Amino acid sequence: MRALLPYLALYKRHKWMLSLGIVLAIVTLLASIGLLTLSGWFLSASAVAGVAGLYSFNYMLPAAGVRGAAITRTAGRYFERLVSHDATFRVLQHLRIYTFSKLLPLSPAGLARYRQGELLNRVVADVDTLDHLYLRVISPLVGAFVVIMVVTIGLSFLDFTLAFTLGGIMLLTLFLMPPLFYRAGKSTGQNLTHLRGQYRQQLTAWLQGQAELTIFGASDRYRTQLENTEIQWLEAQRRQSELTALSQAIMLLIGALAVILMLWMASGGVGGNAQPGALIALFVFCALAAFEALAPVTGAFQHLGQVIASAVRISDLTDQKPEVTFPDTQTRVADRVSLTLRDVQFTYPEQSQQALKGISLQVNAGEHIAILGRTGCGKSTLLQQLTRAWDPQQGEILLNDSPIASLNEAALRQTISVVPQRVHLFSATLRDNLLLASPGSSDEALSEILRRVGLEKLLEDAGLNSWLGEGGRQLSGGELRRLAIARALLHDAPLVLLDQPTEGLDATTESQILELLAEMMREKTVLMVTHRLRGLSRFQQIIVMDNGQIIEQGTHAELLARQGRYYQFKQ
Amino acid sequence: MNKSRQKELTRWLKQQSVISQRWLNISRLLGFVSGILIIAQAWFMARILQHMIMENIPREALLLPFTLLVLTFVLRAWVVWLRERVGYHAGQHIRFAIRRQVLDRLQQAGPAWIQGKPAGSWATLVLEQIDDMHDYYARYLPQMALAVSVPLLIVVAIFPSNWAAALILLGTAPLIPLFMALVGMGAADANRRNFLALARLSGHFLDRLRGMETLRIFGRGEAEIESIRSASEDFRQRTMEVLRLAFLSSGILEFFTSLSIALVAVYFGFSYLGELDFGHYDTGVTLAAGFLALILAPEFFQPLRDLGTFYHAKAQAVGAADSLKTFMETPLAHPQRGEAELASTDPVTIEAEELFITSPEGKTLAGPLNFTLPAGQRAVLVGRSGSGKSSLLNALSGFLSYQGSLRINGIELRDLSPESWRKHLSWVGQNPQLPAATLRDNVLLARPDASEQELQAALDNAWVSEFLPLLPQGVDTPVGDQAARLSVGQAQRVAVARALLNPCSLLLLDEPAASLDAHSEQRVMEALNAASLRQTTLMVTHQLEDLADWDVIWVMQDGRIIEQGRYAELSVAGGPFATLLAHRQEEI
Ligand SMILES: Nc1ncnc2c1ncn2[C@@H]1O[C@H](COP(=O)(O)OP(=O)(O)NP(=O)(O)O)[C@@H](O)[C@H]1O
Ligand SMILES: Nc1ncnc2c1ncn2[C@@H]1O[C@H](COP(=O)(O)OP(=O)(O)OP(=O)(O)O)[C@@H](O)[C@H]1O
Ligand SMILES: [Mg+2]
Ligand SMILES: [Mg+2]
């Protein structure tokens, strides 16, 4: 239960609004006990006085008391909800944005330890689960403790044994029953939080792989695995209902005990007199109405085992230290970039062998480099080292003869343009898919780069306002490839890392793209990775990798003459 | 907010409750029995109170009323315990059936219809939206009968004692439904926009998370926080708009409840003093009559305040059902699910006549396609990007609707049984994905109970087995988020291993050797060329030199097949193929 401290500390930004809801939750309860307690005494006192009591019994004061309590009861509860729900969902909105802010610093390797379907559950579903902590844990518990003390102290003036008997039952239920139901529903709450994220992960994975699962006949047995999670989830959901049912049955029996005891004990004597008269109804009707202050008390702690389980999920995500950290010093983006690598080594997390083994190359400013090798030789791993995705072990990378770890992130991203091997089409519009790089580009500039790269088709119909990605138009494989090139051409960085840019493109489009890149990417440092040996005569150096090490190196003419591994690639 | 539409959703919501009709009637009975025991509870309480207060009867004489009063309390707690569990059991059976229906239509819809929403929008439509219909079935449906039966039963016990007290209850009773419907008339539309904002936030989050690398590369950390801030700000405002209608309705209903309890107390207190004397059947107002009309004063309005509370659960269900109904109404790729199935496992013959392939929206992706592909022959799809080559392979897979004629072995594809049709299909798709957990679970996707020899044979053919030593666990290694553990070229060969592990009647290779070098492509294309001869095959590829023995070469441009024939005929005949082959080996 100690895991809730980082989240109870979020009260402090709304301390007034959340404490006002506590005060209104006591005024509402006090007026609620009073309305039934005053009515119970007023009726009995009026009847005892009888007809002869008129002109001598002050009946106007209770008449204003019930009218005042009725308005206070209804208005206080309404304003408590308005002020407590307003503050709770401002805390949940800040905590959701805070949780999302921890994702990008962990993007390459920290997020790989997690599952993409349960990460979604943590930010949108586990954050909403914490509204129990801010709405119905503190206010019911401290609201029900002040009310009982006020009732017990108030009833103590009339009698002591009666007040402590009613108040004793009311505290023996406030202090013993909630922890009993927290312990009973602790295991179910853990499962209920865990199984919801397991189902949301299996459902999104089943929805995202529906093309591969459907044809290979695997949707049926992945839905059976999916349906089973729901059976277990619905079973844990059912157990929480059986405890809620038992909570109401027990709470109704305790209120029965208070009503029976007050009837049996107040009749004997209230305050030391044999005939209590109206005071008998003053205690019976209080015990009959005082137990609506303990209505939300038991459910407050029962659902706590599920809130604590949720709180651990957000705490785990927000307690992750990103592997790569950036200096805060401001620096200016250079116009020319020359990169130097000296014995760069790198082992992927939870691996024994090395993806990169002692890579050393010197790329001068403005030189165009082509990297070649078999699949799995570390070509993309090398290109992600230059992007500071991971920190190389026992290796040093230099941009302009300065360490790449000494660049501000807002300056590192402005000096490197990347075309990844796998392109992502965001759900946003076509304009916002191109405004990732160069957010200040105008609509005329966006349209021009699309015409150059061969995507003039996207300018038809809705065009720039057209919704792409999921929920909209899905581009083909060769149209995603040219949209990634459009993103990097808009970025306009001195150093460009192309990871198989002409992949899945026909000969006509590849010729047009390679012609565009040669003209566009002049006086720009380029590290062009491809498995395609076309247009390599215009690259100053050709790097051939194998198993994380550079095997051969030289110009296109030199490599052919030497008949190295590049020769078997070409022939 | 269309009343005609919201009446269709309520009709659909009520239809799903028939599966739990028996459980919804038991809770209607148990709720009435609770109303019976409440009346019995206060009648004993009033009689005990009057005897002690007025007649000064000693407590040791009143033992029968105390025993019966305790007996009522024990029975009250039992019925409340039963009704709460009976209500839940009805609620989860309807929710399970609703979710089974939605998941059933996602198997049939296929990727082209699942792609119509972000994957985070589907998740919040299957988990959050379906689970928020529970209180409509568990709580609101049984409450309609209890809001009319118990309150009427309450005042039937008051007419005999004091009619003036009952007219206080009946005087305020009609006001509650009038304000229940007036306040919560826009509650169903606010809930619909609330789930709309949740489905955007859920869907916008998972899209950024899946494309989280491209945000890191371009330095979009500050810009995506601001967009999540806007998406989450709308969700907070939609949530509070929904809640303000629930608090206002509950506040108004409590206002009338509280005043009537005050009026009942004031009327009886004044009546005992003689301040006002009416509504007592020309007999002195007894104390037991006042207590009975005072204990039942909150209980008369309880069922009405619960109806107001659950009336906003109905609005929650109506708003949640707006998006499920839309999904369950939109026609799928084929208007009628096919029952016809082709018997033999022999290679099939593909035929198309004026075949148009259209997107789920309605946009045509491939123009009029006229072609034939005899049994066992292999064809090649070649053309520019965006020409429709992969759209044709998606229509053969059954993922897309087609207007014209596309006959498999003389049987229309729209008529084929989709489940039995995919058993005759293997394929390597463009940008292939690995759904299963491990590398072995992925290669064995078609039949997970394949022998060790047949698994080893697929890994050897697809060149997968050469990079297995690098993997820590071997063929049992996980692949992670979007096959993170593997490189693109290594993930490509695992997808190729799937296609070759089971015999098929039509093989649909879509750029099967992408992200492969010169030598690894040649090793893989030996397996794919050998496999292409065992059945009907149709591959999309950009290599043009390596293909010379393929039975026919289709050249697609703007959705139309503009050339056909062998490599020897097409290469020297001019046309688009020669020009598209001209850029190939241009410098060699
Ligand atoms: N769901 C869709 N809605 C609208 N247009 C689409 C959709 N899917 C694809 N298109 C477009 O339809 C055309 C054909 O797409 P597609 O069939 O994938 O091209 P392709 O044959 O695969 N060429 P390639 O890029 O090499 O894969 C392109 O212009 C696409 O942008
Ligand atoms: N996220 C990862 N975790 C662990 N190992 C990885 C990861 N990504 C790649 N590897 C390993 O690194 C090796 C090569 O990595 P990399 O992806 O750089 O190769 P590549 O040259 O990009 O391959 P291709 O050229 O086919 O895309 C592979 O053997 C692969 O198993
Ligand atoms: Mg790669
Ligand atoms: Mg394609």
GROMACS .gro file of N, CA and C in nm, chain B residues 256-368:
model
  339
  827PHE      N    1  -3.605   1.702  -0.437
  827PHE     CA    2  -3.745   1.667  -0.417
  827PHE      C    3  -3.761   1.559  -0.312
  828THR      N    4  -3.667   1.465  -0.306
  828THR     CA    5  -3.671   1.363  -0.202
  828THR      C    6  -3.658   1.424  -0.064
  829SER      N    7  -3.565   1.518  -0.047
  829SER     CA    8  -3.540   1.576   0.084
  829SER      C    9  -3.657   1.663   0.130
  830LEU      N   10  -3.715   1.740   0.039
  830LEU     CA   11  -3.827   1.827   0.076
  830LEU      C   12  -3.948   1.745   0.118
  831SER      N   13  -3.976   1.635   0.048
  831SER     CA   14  -4.091   1.552   0.083
  831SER      C   15  -4.071   1.483   0.218
  832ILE      N   16  -3.948   1.445   0.251
  832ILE     CA   17  -3.921   1.394   0.385
  832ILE      C   18  -3.940   1.504   0.489
  833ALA      N   19  -3.906   1.628   0.453
  833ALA     CA   20  -3.930   1.740   0.543
  833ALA      C   21  -4.079   1.770   0.556
  834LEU      N   22  -4.152   1.768   0.444
  834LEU     CA   23  -4.295   1.795   0.448
  834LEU      C   24  -4.369   1.689   0.530
  835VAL      N   25  -4.328   1.563   0.517
  835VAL     CA   26  -4.389   1.457   0.596
  835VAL      C   27  -4.365   1.480   0.744
  836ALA      N   28  -4.242   1.516   0.781
  836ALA     CA   29  -4.211   1.544   0.921
  836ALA      C   30  -4.287   1.665   0.971
  837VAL      N   31  -4.292   1.772   0.891
  837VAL     CA   32  -4.362   1.893   0.933
  837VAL      C   33  -4.511   1.867   0.948
  838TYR      N   34  -4.570   1.794   0.853
  838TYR     CA   35  -4.714   1.768   0.859
  838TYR      C   36  -4.751   1.690   0.984
  839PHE      N   37  -4.673   1.588   1.019
  839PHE     CA   38  -4.707   1.505   1.134
  839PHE      C   39  -4.680   1.578   1.265
  840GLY      N   40  -4.568   1.650   1.273
  840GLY     CA   41  -4.539   1.726   1.393
  840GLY      C   42  -4.645   1.831   1.421
  841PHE      N   43  -4.691   1.899   1.316
  841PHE     CA   44  -4.799   1.996   1.333
  841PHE      C   45  -4.931   1.926   1.366
  842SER      N   46  -4.953   1.808   1.308
  842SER     CA   47  -5.079   1.737   1.330
  842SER      C   48  -5.092   1.690   1.474
  843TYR      N   49  -4.981   1.646   1.535
  843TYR     CA   50  -4.987   1.600   1.673
  843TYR      C   51  -5.021   1.714   1.768
  844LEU      N   52  -4.970   1.834   1.741
  844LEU     CA   53  -5.000   1.951   1.823
  844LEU      C   54  -5.139   2.007   1.798
  845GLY      N   55  -5.205   1.967   1.690
  845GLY     CA   56  -5.331   2.027   1.653
  845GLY      C   57  -5.319   2.153   1.570
  846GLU      N   58  -5.198   2.188   1.525
  846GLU     CA   59  -5.182   2.307   1.441
  846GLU      C   60  -5.261   2.294   1.312
  847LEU      N   61  -5.254   2.178   1.248
  847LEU     CA   62  -5.336   2.147   1.132
  847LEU      C   63  -5.390   2.006   1.150
  848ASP      N   64  -5.518   1.986   1.120
  848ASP     CA   65  -5.586   1.859   1.144
  848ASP      C   66  -5.667   1.816   1.022
  849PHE      N   67  -5.603   1.741   0.933
  849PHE     CA   68  -5.673   1.682   0.820
  849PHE      C   69  -5.598   1.557   0.777
  850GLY      N   70  -5.665   1.474   0.699
  850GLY     CA   71  -5.605   1.351   0.650
  850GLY      C   72  -5.576   1.248   0.756
  851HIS      N   73  -5.669   1.223   0.848
  851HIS     CA   74  -5.648   1.125   0.953
  851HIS      C   75  -5.771   1.039   0.982
  852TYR      N   76  -5.869   1.035   0.891
  852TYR     CA   77  -5.985   0.946   0.903
  852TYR      C   78  -6.056   0.963   1.037
  853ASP      N   79  -6.087   1.089   1.071
  853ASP     CA   80  -6.161   1.129   1.192
  853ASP      C   81  -6.120   1.049   1.315
  854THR      N   82  -5.991   1.015   1.323
  854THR     CA   83  -5.933   0.950   1.439
  854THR      C   84  -5.802   1.019   1.472
  855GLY      N   85  -5.771   1.027   1.601
  855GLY     CA   86  -5.649   1.092   1.645
  855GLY      C   87  -5.525   1.033   1.581
  856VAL      N   88  -5.437   1.119   1.530
  856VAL     CA   89  -5.318   1.072   1.461
  856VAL      C   90  -5.228   0.999   1.560
  857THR      N   91  -5.203   0.872   1.532
  857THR     CA   92  -5.118   0.790   1.618
  857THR      C   93  -4.972   0.813   1.585
  858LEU      N   94  -4.886   0.785   1.683
  858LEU     CA   95  -4.743   0.799   1.662
  858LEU      C   96  -4.691   0.695   1.563
  859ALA      N   97  -4.746   0.574   1.565
  859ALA     CA   98  -4.701   0.471   1.472
  859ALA      C   99  -4.730   0.508   1.328
  860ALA      N  100  -4.837   0.583   1.304
  860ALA     CA  101  -4.865   0.630   1.169
  860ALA      C  102  -4.758   0.728   1.122
  861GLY      N  103  -4.715   0.818   1.210
  861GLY     CA  104  -4.612   0.914   1.172
  861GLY      C  105  -4.478   0.849   1.146
  862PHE      N  106  -4.438   0.755   1.232
  862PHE     CA  107  -4.310   0.688   1.213
  862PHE      C  108  -4.310   0.604   1.087
  863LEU      N  109  -4.420   0.533   1.060
  863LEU     CA  110  -4.430   0.454   0.938
  863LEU      C  111  -4.418   0.544   0.815
  864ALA      N  112  -4.488   0.657   0.815
  864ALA     CA  113  -4.481   0.749   0.702
  864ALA      C  114  -4.350   0.826   0.698
  865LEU      N  115  -4.267   0.815   0.801
  865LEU     CA  116  -4.137   0.881   0.804
  865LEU      C  117  -4.022   0.788   0.767
  866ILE      N  118  -4.027   0.662   0.810
  866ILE     CA  119  -3.925   0.566   0.769
  866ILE      C  120  -3.939   0.532   0.622
  867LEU      N  121  -4.062   0.520   0.572
  867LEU     CA  122  -4.085   0.492   0.431
  867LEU      C  123  -4.073   0.615   0.342
  868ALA      N  124  -4.062   0.734   0.399
  868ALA     CA  125  -4.042   0.853   0.316
  868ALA      C  126  -3.912   0.846   0.236
  869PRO      N  127  -3.795   0.814   0.294
  869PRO     CA  128  -3.677   0.793   0.208
  869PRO      C  129  -3.690   0.673   0.117
  870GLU      N  130  -3.755   0.566   0.163
  870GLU     CA  131  -3.765   0.444   0.084
  870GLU      C  132  -3.865   0.456  -0.030
  871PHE      N  133  -3.959   0.549  -0.023
  871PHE     CA  134  -4.047   0.572  -0.136
  871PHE      C  135  -3.970   0.630  -0.254
  872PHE      N  136  -3.878   0.722  -0.227
  872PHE     CA  137  -3.801   0.788  -0.332
  872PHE      C  138  -3.671   0.716  -0.365
  873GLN      N  139  -3.638   0.611  -0.290
  873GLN     CA  140  -3.512   0.537  -0.319
  873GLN      C  141  -3.522   0.480  -0.461
  874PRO      N  142  -3.620   0.393  -0.492
  874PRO     CA  143  -3.635   0.337  -0.627
  874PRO      C  144  -3.638   0.445  -0.737
  875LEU      N  145  -3.689   0.565  -0.707
  875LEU     CA  146  -3.691   0.671  -0.807
  875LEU      C  147  -3.554   0.736  -0.823
  876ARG      N  148  -3.480   0.750  -0.713
  876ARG     CA  149  -3.346   0.805  -0.722
  876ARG      C  150  -3.249   0.705  -0.784
  877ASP      N  151  -3.273   0.576  -0.763
  877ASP     CA  152  -3.193   0.475  -0.831
  877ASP      C  153  -3.226   0.469  -0.980
  878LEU      N  154  -3.352   0.493  -1.017
  878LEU     CA  155  -3.386   0.502  -1.158
  878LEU      C  156  -3.317   0.621  -1.223
  879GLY      N  157  -3.307   0.733  -1.151
  879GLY     CA  158  -3.233   0.846  -1.203
  879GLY      C  159  -3.085   0.820  -1.214
  880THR      N  160  -3.029   0.749  -1.115
  880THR     CA  161  -2.888   0.711  -1.121
  880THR      C  162  -2.862   0.617  -1.238
  881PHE      N  163  -2.948   0.517  -1.256
  881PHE     CA  164  -2.930   0.420  -1.362
  881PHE      C  165  -2.979   0.470  -1.497
  882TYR      N  166  -3.058   0.578  -1.500
  882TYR     CA  167  -3.097   0.637  -1.628
  882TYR      C  168  -2.976   0.693  -1.701
  883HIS      N  169  -2.873   0.732  -1.627
  883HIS     CA  170  -2.749   0.778  -1.686
  883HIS      C  171  -2.652   0.665  -1.714
  884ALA      N  172  -2.678   0.546  -1.661
  884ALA     CA  173  -2.612   0.426  -1.711
  884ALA      C  174  -2.670   0.383  -1.844
  885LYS      N  175  -2.800   0.404  -1.865
  885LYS     CA  176  -2.860   0.380  -1.995
  885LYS      C  177  -2.804   0.475  -2.100
  886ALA      N  178  -2.785   0.602  -2.064
  886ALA     CA  179  -2.723   0.696  -2.156
  886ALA      C  180  -2.577   0.660  -2.182
  887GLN      N  181  -2.510   0.603  -2.082
  887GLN     CA  182  -2.375   0.553  -2.103
  887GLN      C  183  -2.374   0.436  -2.202
  888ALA      N  184  -2.474   0.349  -2.193
  888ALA     CA  185  -2.481   0.235  -2.284
  888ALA      C  186  -2.521   0.279  -2.425
  889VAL      N  187  -2.611   0.377  -2.435
  889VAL     CA  188  -2.653   0.425  -2.567
  889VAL      C  189  -2.537   0.493  -2.638
  890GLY      N  190  -2.460   0.575  -2.566
  890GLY     CA  191  -2.342   0.635  -2.624
  890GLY      C  192  -2.236   0.533  -2.660
  891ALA      N  193  -2.224   0.427  -2.580
  891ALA     CA  194  -2.126   0.323  -2.609
  891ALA      C  195  -2.169   0.236  -2.726
  892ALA      N  196  -2.300   0.222  -2.749
  892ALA     CA  197  -2.349   0.139  -2.858
  892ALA      C  198  -2.353   0.211  -2.991
  893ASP      N  199  -2.332   0.342  -2.993
  893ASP     CA  200  -2.336   0.416  -3.119
  893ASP      C  201  -2.228   0.369  -3.215
  894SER      N  202  -2.109   0.337  -3.162
  894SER     CA  203  -1.998   0.295  -3.246
  894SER      C  204  -1.998   0.145  -3.272
  895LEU      N  205  -2.055   0.065  -3.183
  895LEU     CA  206  -2.068  -0.078  -3.211
  895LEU      C  207  -2.172  -0.103  -3.319
  896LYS      N  208  -2.285  -0.032  -3.314
  896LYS     CA  209  -2.386  -0.049  -3.418
  896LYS      C  210  -2.331  -0.010  -3.554
  897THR      N  211  -2.256   0.100  -3.561
  897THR     CA  212  -2.198   0.142  -3.688
  897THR      C  213  -2.110   0.033  -3.746
  898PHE      N  214  -2.028  -0.030  -3.662
  898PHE     CA  215  -1.942  -0.138  -3.709
  898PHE      C  216  -2.024  -0.258  -3.756
  899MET      N  217  -2.123  -0.299  -3.676
  899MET     CA  218  -2.203  -0.416  -3.708
  899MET      C  219  -2.299  -0.394  -3.825
  900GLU      N  220  -2.315  -0.270  -3.872
  900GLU     CA  221  -2.401  -0.243  -3.987
  900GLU      C  222  -2.323  -0.233  -4.117
  901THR      N  223  -2.200  -0.184  -4.113
  901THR     CA  224  -2.124  -0.165  -4.236
  901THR      C  225  -2.100  -0.300  -4.303
  902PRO      N  226  -2.134  -0.314  -4.431
  902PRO     CA  227  -2.112  -0.442  -4.498
  902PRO      C  228  -1.963  -0.472  -4.512
  903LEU      N  229  -1.931  -0.601  -4.511
  903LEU     CA  230  -1.793  -0.646  -4.516
  903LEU      C  231  -1.747  -0.653  -4.661
  904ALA      N  232  -1.634  -0.718  -4.685
  904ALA     CA  233  -1.579  -0.727  -4.820
  904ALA      C  234  -1.677  -0.795  -4.914
  905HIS      N  235  -1.739  -0.903  -4.869
  905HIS     CA  236  -1.840  -0.971  -4.949
  905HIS      C  237  -1.974  -0.962  -4.879
  906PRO      N  238  -2.078  -0.913  -4.948
  906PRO     CA  239  -2.207  -0.892  -4.880
  906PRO      C  240  -2.263  -1.018  -4.815
  907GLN      N  241  -2.244  -1.133  -4.877
  907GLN     CA  242  -2.289  -1.261  -4.823
  907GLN      C  243  -2.169  -1.352  -4.804
  908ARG      N  244  -2.151  -1.401  -4.682
  908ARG     CA  245  -2.044  -1.496  -4.655
  908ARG      C  246  -2.065  -1.623  -4.736
  909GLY      N  247  -1.960  -1.667  -4.805
  909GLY     CA  248  -1.973  -1.778  -4.896
  909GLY      C  249  -1.978  -1.912  -4.825
  910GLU      N  250  -2.054  -2.004  -4.883
  910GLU     CA  251  -2.058  -2.142  -4.837
  910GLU      C  252  -1.997  -2.239  -4.936
  911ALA      N  253  -1.986  -2.201  -5.063
  911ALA     CA  254  -1.925  -2.288  -5.163
  911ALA      C  255  -1.778  -2.310  -5.131
  912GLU      N  256  -1.730  -2.430  -5.161
  912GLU     CA  257  -1.590  -2.463  -5.142
  912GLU      C  258  -1.545  -2.558  -5.252
  913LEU      N  259  -1.424  -2.537  -5.301
  913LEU     CA  260  -1.368  -2.620  -5.407
  913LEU      C  261  -1.302  -2.743  -5.345
  914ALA      N  262  -1.329  -2.859  -5.403
  914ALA     CA  263  -1.296  -2.986  -5.337
  914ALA      C  264  -1.147  -3.015  -5.340
  915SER      N  265  -1.090  -3.029  -5.460
  915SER     CA  266  -0.953  -3.077  -5.473
  915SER      C  267  -0.853  -2.976  -5.420
  916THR      N  268  -0.739  -3.027  -5.374
  916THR     CA  269  -0.626  -2.944  -5.335
  916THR      C  270  -0.529  -2.921  -5.449
  917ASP      N  271  -0.568  -2.954  -5.572
  917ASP     CA  272  -0.485  -2.932  -5.688
  917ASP      C  273  -0.472  -2.783  -5.716
  918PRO      N  274  -0.371  -2.742  -5.792
  918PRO     CA  275  -0.356  -2.600  -5.825
  918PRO      C  276  -0.481  -2.546  -5.894
  919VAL      N  277  -0.519  -2.425  -5.855
  919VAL     CA  278  -0.642  -2.363  -5.902
  919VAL      C  279  -0.614  -2.279  -6.026
  920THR      N  280  -0.720  -2.248  -6.100
  920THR     CA  281  -0.712  -2.161  -6.216
  920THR      C  282  -0.776  -2.027  -6.183
  921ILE      N  283  -0.701  -1.919  -6.200
  921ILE     CA  284  -0.748  -1.785  -6.171
  921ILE      C  285  -0.804  -1.724  -6.299
  922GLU      N  286  -0.915  -1.653  -6.287
  922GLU     CA  287  -0.976  -1.586  -6.402
  922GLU      C  288  -1.039  -1.456  -6.357
  923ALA      N  289  -1.023  -1.352  -6.438
  923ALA     CA  290  -1.081  -1.221  -6.409
  923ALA      C  291  -1.141  -1.164  -6.536
  924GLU      N  292  -1.260  -1.106  -6.524
  924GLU     CA  293  -1.329  -1.042  -6.635
  924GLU      C  294  -1.383  -0.908  -6.586
  925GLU      N  295  -1.327  -0.799  -6.638
  925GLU     CA  296  -1.366  -0.664  -6.598
  925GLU      C  297  -1.359  -0.647  -6.446
  926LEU      N  298  -1.253  -0.703  -6.387
  926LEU     CA  299  -1.239  -0.707  -6.243
  926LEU      C  300  -1.194  -0.572  -6.190
  927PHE      N  301  -1.278  -0.509  -6.108
  927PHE     CA  302  -1.243  -0.387  -6.037
  927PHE      C  303  -1.226  -0.419  -5.890
  928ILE      N  304  -1.116  -0.373  -5.831
  928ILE     CA  305  -1.089  -0.391  -5.689
  928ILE      C  306  -1.103  -0.256  -5.621
  929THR      N  307  -1.182  -0.252  -5.514
  929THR     CA  308  -1.214  -0.127  -5.447
  929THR      C  309  -1.173  -0.132  -5.300
  930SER      N  310  -1.141  -0.015  -5.247
  930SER     CA  311  -1.111   0.000  -5.105
  930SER      C  312  -1.240  -0.005  -5.025
  931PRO      N  313  -1.231  -0.026  -4.893
  931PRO     CA  314  -1.353  -0.024  -4.811
  931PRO      C  315  -1.430   0.107  -4.821
  932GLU      N  316  -1.361   0.219  -4.840
  932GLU     CA  317  -1.431   0.346  -4.860
  932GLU      C  318  -1.513   0.344  -4.988
  933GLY      N  319  -1.458   0.288  -5.095
  933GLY     CA  320  -1.527   0.285  -5.223
  933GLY      C  321  -1.435   0.318  -5.339
  934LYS      N  322  -1.314   0.364  -5.308
  934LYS     CA  323  -1.218   0.398  -5.412
  934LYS      C  324  -1.164   0.272  -5.478
  935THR      N  325  -1.162   0.272  -5.611
  935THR     CA  326  -1.108   0.158  -5.685
  935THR      C  327  -0.956   0.164  -5.683
  936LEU      N  328  -0.894   0.050  -5.651
  936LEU     CA  329  -0.749   0.041  -5.643
  936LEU      C  330  -0.687  -0.022  -5.767
  937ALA      N  331  -0.763  -0.103  -5.840
  937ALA     CA  332  -0.716  -0.162  -5.965
  937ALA      C  333  -0.827  -0.151  -6.068
  938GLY      N  334  -0.792  -0.102  -6.187
  938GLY     CA  335  -0.888  -0.085  -6.293
  938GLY      C  336  -0.933  -0.217  -6.350
  939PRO      N  337  -0.995  -0.214  -6.469
  939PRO     CA  338  -1.048  -0.339  -6.526
  939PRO      C  339  -0.939  -0.440  -6.557
   0.00000   0.00000   0.00000
